[PDB]
Amino acid sequence: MDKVQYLTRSAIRRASTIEMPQQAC
């Protein structure tokens, strides 16, 4: 679940890191 939720997040995370910053913390 955490592994599946990790990739799922990396999907939006990668598509949600253009305007605003986002690196782990």
d(CA 23, CA 11): 14
| Tokens matching residue 19 | 């305007």
Method: NMR
d(CA 14, CA 10): 6
Q: Which helix (H) or strand (E) holds 11?
A: helix 4-14
d(CA 22, CA 12): 11
The answer to whether 15 and 9 are in contact (CB under 8 A) is: no
* R_g over Cα of the chain: 9
d(CA 1, CA 16): 21
* Cβ-Cβ contacts under 8 Å for 16 (sequence gap 6 or more): 22
Map residue 5 onto helix, strand or coil. Answer: helix
d(CA 10, CA 6): 6
- DSSP code for 23: S
Q: How far is CA 16 from the centre of its chain?
A: 7
